[PDB]
Amino acid sequence: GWFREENDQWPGQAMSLRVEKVLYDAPTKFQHLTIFESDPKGPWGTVMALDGCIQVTDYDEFVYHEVLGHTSLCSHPKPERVLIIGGGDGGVLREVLRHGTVEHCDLVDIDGEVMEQSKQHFPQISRSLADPRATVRVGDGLAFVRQTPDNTYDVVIIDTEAFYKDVLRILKPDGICCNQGESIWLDLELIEKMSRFIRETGFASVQYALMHVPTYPCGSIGTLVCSKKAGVDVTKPLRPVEDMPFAKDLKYYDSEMHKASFALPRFARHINN
Amino acid sequence: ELISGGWFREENDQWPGQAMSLRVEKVLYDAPTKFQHLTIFESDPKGPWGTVMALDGCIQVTDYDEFVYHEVLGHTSLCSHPKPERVLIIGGGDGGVLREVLRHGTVEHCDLVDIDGEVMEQSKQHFPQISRSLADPRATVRVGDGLAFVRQTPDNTYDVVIIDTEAFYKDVLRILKPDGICCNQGESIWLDLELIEKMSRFIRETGFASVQYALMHVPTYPCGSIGTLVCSKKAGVDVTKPLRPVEDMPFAKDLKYYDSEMHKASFALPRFARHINN
Ligand SMILES: C[S@@H](CCCN)C[C@H]1O[C@@H](n2cnc3c(N)ncnc32)[C@H](O)[C@@H]1O
Ligand SMILES: C[S@@H](CCCN)C[C@H]1O[C@@H](n2cnc3c(N)ncnc32)[C@H](O)[C@@H]1O
Ligand SMILES: O=C(CCS)Nc1ccccc1
Ligand SMILES: O=C(CCS)Nc1ccccc1
Incomplete structure (x- = not known):
């Protein structure tokens, strides 16, 4: 499937990445924490999102x-x-x-x-x-x-x-x-x-x-x-x-x-x- | 063939596994020319992008x-x-x-x-x-x-x-x-x-x-x-x-x-x- 990112302040656009392997996906005491490996044919490698905002990619x-x-x-x-x-x-x-x-x-x-x-x-x-x-x-x-x-x-x-x-x-x-x-x-x-x-x-x-x-x-x-x-x-x-x-x-x-x-x-x- | 209220999605063969997309508010043009596909539309009016031009599915100009x-x-x-x-x-x-x-x-x-x-x-x-x-x-x-x-x-x-x-x-x-x-x-x-x-x-x-x-x-x-x-x-x-x-x-x-x-x-x-x- 796909990780999609969008923002209610910037309403009509989105950016998506293909999920190759979900590695973590749970609420935390303070925020939603998502980690997944992206398309191995693309450059992004491992990606981390917080409350659905990308924060870190290998790339x-x-x-x-x-x-x-x-x-x-x-x-x-x-x-x-x-x-x-x-x-x-x-x-x-x-x-x-x-x-x-x-x-x-x-x-x-x-x-x-x-x-x-x-x-x-x-x-x-x-x-x-x-x-x-x-x-x-x-x-x-x-x-x-x-x-x-x-x-x-x-x-x-x-x-x-x-x-x-x-x-x-x-x-x-x-x-x-x-x-x-x-x-x-x-x-x-x-x-x-x-x-x-x-x-x-x-x-x-x-x-x-x-x-x-x-x-x-x-x-x-x-x-x-x-x-x-x-x-x-x-x-x-x-x-x-x-x-x-x-x-x-x-x-x-x-x-x-x-x-x-x-x-x-x-x-x-x-x-x- | 694009229609108002749908989304324009762009992908690339050459970098698989990413996509980008824009909500279409109104289509102002969408047809082949004798050289390329040309797409123009107003984007979401609550967003900053205004009018948008795409050629062969790659965005090329926005008002923004x-x-x-x-x-x-x-x-x-x-x-x-x-x-x-x-x-x-x-x-x-x-x-x-x-x-x-x-x-x-x-x-x-x-x-x-x-x-x-x-x-x-x-x-x-x-x-x-x-x-x-x-x-x-x-x-x-x-x-x-x-x-x-x-x-x-x-x-x-x-x-x-x-x-x-x-x-x-x-x-x-x-x-x-x-x-x-x-x-x-x-x-x-x-x-x-x-x-x-x-x-x-x-x-x-x-x-x-x-x-x-x-x-x-x-x-x-x-x-x-x-x-x-x-x-x-x-x-x-x-x-x-x-x-x-x-x-x-x-x-x-x-x-x-x-x-x-x-x-x-x-x-x-x-x-x-x-x-x-x-
Ligand atoms: C992931 S890091 C940003 C990615 C680029 N290195 C953002 C971190 O700041 C933390 N954060 C958010 N609020 C606070 C407060 N109030 N205090 C400390 N750390 C915080 C949050 O847990 C993220 O890990
Ligand atoms: C729209 S512009 C790109 C956006 C930056 N203002 C790209 C233009 O290059 C033209 N183009 C493409 N190939 C050629 C050649 N070979 N010659 C002239 N113009 C060309 C094409 O019709 C676009 O309008
Ligand atoms: O990195 C890219 C594209 C070109 S560099 N897109 C992207 C990044 C994060 C989330 C969704 C898409
Ligand atoms: O502007 C953005 C994202 C952050 S500004 N997306 C976008 C808009 C139009 C065209 C291509 C991408």
Whole structure:
């Protein structure tokens, strides 16, 4: 049969993939979690959906994982302690762990079932979950950051007021925050709203980086990249990845794509000023 | 044979196991032309897509993201040339590239050849924002094979050739002036990276001095992006930095996707694809 994806907000279209083998399909305590192998004659491999929205495919998971992971960290002078909220597939953490500067990373994900299913059906994404520089919790990020002290983390990556206020609060003075931002084609209003809320919460700067992800609606998604410190230009890498030893293992991210990600179509450019 | 209230479904033989579909609100055209199947319909009015054109079952234009591809092709090429006075567009029957090229004050004449006169007719009726350029008298619009058209054209006729569709590419090189720019509808770095590598190498070997691939976000196309090979007949020219920035022309603010920053960023490729460009 077929997995069909559609959206009541964008009513008259759908996107479908052939299911070759259902590997998981159950409610969880927090969301519907579907994993299946897609057409072995196609490129998508294993696919994971949450409440019927594709979240991860074998084919392009590298895109969003490297952009969040390295755009943020390469914007920091020396990132040693890292929080990931959500990110339970482990992909971002894998990308975080490539950085030698990283001493420790906590990863907090509301949904234990996601990580378990990930270890089972996404080995190349989940390996990183048992790494000794990581600690993995099953819990609400909202609570977790409310119970975290000031000046704890150099980087907070949010891969899903008092929340945004807390995040600024837990970052050190050169803190860098990034999130999974939405689509400039479907959520532009909401991107504008967030950008400005995030800034009025007390972050010095907020800049939106666009990336190409084929399996997400409209072919792209972005991340808001936010600096606690004033005078920081996140759009030009602070510490290029080309000097670190893992650069040539990356399949999407480099310094030219860093810079380029912040050039927006004219209709959307007002997000970045 | 499509009917209002049903869904248009597209699949591909070549990438089995995916499908894409749009609800049809009203059929405005659905018949074979002497060249291809041409489908036009209004999509769901509670959605953003407006009117939609399909050729042989591949969507080609929607009201929605129309401007991306047309502006990228018109402007990346024209802003890479010192003085584009005479322009040829092969394909482009809908009028979209031509509306972008005609924005430019230096353009003195533009010929467009598209093999299917029906595409041009139905664009006149159903895409007024795209096709108004087609009646412009700085343009000459012929129905004809672009291949036979370039073959019958003398050397160094054009400053810029835009292909919106080996003996062909050599003709293209021949009909351009020493200063010429050619750009085309490239394919996708996700679906035909090998093809893009091959086209580029051989456009170079044909005799073009440089060829660089420009990536753009088009949400209605397979995998949500597509590209254009931007090729310079003369040596030592860098198409990846605007020769004549659009920001110095009167119409810069009318554009919805393209500007100089977008121009430079479009040549940055994800690492797996960057060898196309070096
Ligand atoms: C799958 S991941 C997105 C895929 C790209 N790596 C989205 C994760 O965020 C979690 N999530 C959602 N809400 C929360 C909260 N409130 N806290 C923590 N994690 C959360 C959710 O369980 C997904 O695993
Ligand atoms: C509609 S346009 C594609 C959408 C981008 N605006 C593609 C056009 O190329 C024409 N086409 C295809 N082959 C040729 C040749 N050989 N010559 C000229 N025009 C051609 C075809 O009729 C379409 O209208
Ligand atoms: O636009 C989308 C999906 C996300 S924007 N689908 C689509 C619409 C028209 C044509 C082809 C695809
Ligand atoms: O990946 C693709 C198409 C081209 S890259 N489609 C798709 C992705 C997710 C769900 C349904 C379809």
